[PDB]
Symmetry: none
Subunit: 183 residues, 2 copies
């Protein structure tokens, strides 16, 4: 079953509302006035260059960032071309990337929400139609819609009364989610 | 002015014939005799989307290149998917190492290219055309720029000059 961590900052938010906010912030720092854009320009595969246990990317319009964790592979020009595939265990969303292979992995300076124990696995044979590819490809431009669809399905699998319209508070009460430090 | 280094293997080759051979080999390992594919490696240094180098190896063979300068890739920023900035050098050879990046077998390098494309030109920039072409082993854009630079030293020089002739003209070095 999916497990979720959320910053205390977002306790009262629905998952959908949170994802819309992260996506808006990825598109424009001014969706969160008061923020600065000064994160290191870092990211990629860990260890890379085209495979790793993490793939991480930061916006260049803001410090919004994600980290995909699992056992991931990118085909580049090999068939099926431009496919990210493998096992996707977690998606963590927040602000500012730090780290990399040389310091124990990528991290977020502020982790806002992390969706873990996802159990997603896309074989190479599915190419760009794989769920892993669609989720991560969306996030590279700040589009959380594919991620949102998967989170909704995974929550409903726990209990059909849970959904992306549940608040993090409600998911905690249901035993799926727990709070982490302020963002 | 442009400066060229070349393996003596290509002393009597013309620049155009060498580029055609590297491109052919980028496309098919069988394009050269007795070669084996055994080198995916490359990217920006430092990256992820900007660097003093961008390097890539073929998937069909170990043919590879390294672009050197002050390079930027826009990803989704307008104009989207544009590689721009200053391109000072292109090195061509076989098999990538490192990540600065280097070639196991460096065959030819073209340096002091003096190319500079602003972001506003988007994918029409010369830098973009040169490097993007080489990502699929297409050396035509590179070749046209080399030809212009050679003629700027002297109109009698060209991509149909041999490397030895360019050495005699003070532009190339074995
Ligand atoms: C890791 C470093 C990466 C590099 C160097 C890279 C490189 C490229 C290049 C050069 C192209 C253009 C190909 C062309 O038309 O000439 C491309 C296209 C594409 N890339 Fe990647 N990419 C990377 C990562 C990713 C990741 C992680 C994803 C997905 C999660 C992705 C998804 C795609 C897609 C979907 C296309 C368009 C395919 C099409 O519609 O033809 N890329 N990439
Ligand atoms: C540095 C890592 C790179 C990544 C992560 C990357 C990623 C991508 C992605 C995801 C797309 C598809 C866009 C979409 O479907 O909305 C794309 C397309 C493209 N990429 Fe990149 N790319 C990289 C490097 C490069 C480089 C270095 C060049 C040029 C030298 C390049 C040239 C292109 C071009 C021209 C397209 C559009 C292809 C088309 O629509 O025909 N890419 N890239």
């Amino acid at each position: 079953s999916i497990s979720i961590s959320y910053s205390t900052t977002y306790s009262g938010w629905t998952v959908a509302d949170y994802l819309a906010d992260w996506s808006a912030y990825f598109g424009d720092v001014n969706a969160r006035p008061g923020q600065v854009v000064d994160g290191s320009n870092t990211g990629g595969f860990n260890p890379g260059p085209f495979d790793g246990s993490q793939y991480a990317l930061k916006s260049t319009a803001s410090d919004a960032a994600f980290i995909a964790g699992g056992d991931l592979h990118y085909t580049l020009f090999s068939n099926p071309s431009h496919t990210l595939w493998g096992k996707l265990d977690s998606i963590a969303l927040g602000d500012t990337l730090t780290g990399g292979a040389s310091s124990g992995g990528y991290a977020l300076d502020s982790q806002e929400v992390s969706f873990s124990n996802l159990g997603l696995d896309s074989p190479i044979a599915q190419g760009r139609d794989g769920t892993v590819h669609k989720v991560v490809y969306g996030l590279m431009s700040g589009d959380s819609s594919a991620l949102q669809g998967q989170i909704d399905a995974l929550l409903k699998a726990v209990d059909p009364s849970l959904s992306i319209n549940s608040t993090f508070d409600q998911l905690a009460a249901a035993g799926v989610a727990h709070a982490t430090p302020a963002a």
